[model samples]
Target: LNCGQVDSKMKPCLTYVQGGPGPSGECCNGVRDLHNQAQSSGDRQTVCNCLKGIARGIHNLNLNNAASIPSKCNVNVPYTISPDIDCSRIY
Candidate 1:
């Protein structure tokens, strides 16, 4: 259910990271907002699951952009953006 919030907030990133040269302003803002929304360990873990689902569900997602865009937005992500990530193991 909470991933719904994550979905809406993170929707901006979907297209920005699809084999693009750079992230859009709105996408970066959405990334920052998503980072800020991590108020608890559970929240962060939930983000991990949602992001993994996104990484898997979306076709042609630029892996490099997904990985590096977090730092591009000046935000540190807790885990890598990939379906292969062990989200349960994230700190």
Candidate 2:
């Protein structure tokens, strides 16, 4: 799965990725929803790659903000949002 749905789901995170002070309420909400929805191993991997691809595509993305999102949003993603990561190893 290419996770096109996940891409749109995470659109709100763009603000934070662009080095904002923090995520908007909507952004955090989206994060929580996405975390909740990615229930299966395949789904998790899809979402992971989606996010990883986003991080790679955005120049000067705020990695610290990205890293803190799970805790900050009170959610959990299967993988860390780093520029370099192997999605297959996440599950």
Candidate 3:
């Protein structure tokens, strides 16, 4: 899946988003990189799916905390972060 690349690249932010202390500089960079990489609606949808998959895999992901990552790190996210998401409807 195309999300694999983004998943791997943004791995650092995963822990931070799940309610770890906070996003580190590395995590911030990852967030920014993904935001920069997604230059189109398709790319944004792919990122939404990637993030949703990652969050789904986490047993106790705090949706609020995860949602705050983008704003906290100064990156713009196209989709809202939550446990229940319609990936197909993202675009």
Cα RMSDs of all predictions?
1.6, 1.6, 1.9
The regions of model 1 sitting more than 4 angstroms off are: none
Q: Tens digit of lDDT per residue, candidate 2, span 4-85? A: 8887777887878788777778888888888778778888888887877777788779889888888888886546667788
The parts of candidate 2 lying over 4 Å away from their true place are none
Model with the higher TM-score, candidate 2 or 3? 2
Which residue segments of model 3 deviate by more than 4 Å?
none
Q: Which of the predicted structures, 2 or 3, would earn the higher lDDT when compared with the native?
A: 2
Q: Which scores higher on lDDT, 1 or 3?
A: 1
Q: Work out candidate 1's RMSD over C-alphas.
A: 1.6
Residue 64 error, candidate 3, Å: 1.7
Clashing pairs for model 1 are none
RMSD of 2: 1.6
lDDT value, candidate 2, whole model: 0.79
Clashes of 1: 0
Locate the minimum summed-lDDT window of 10 residues in model 3. 76-85
Instruction: Give the worst 10-residue stretch by lDDT in candidate 1.
Output: 15-24
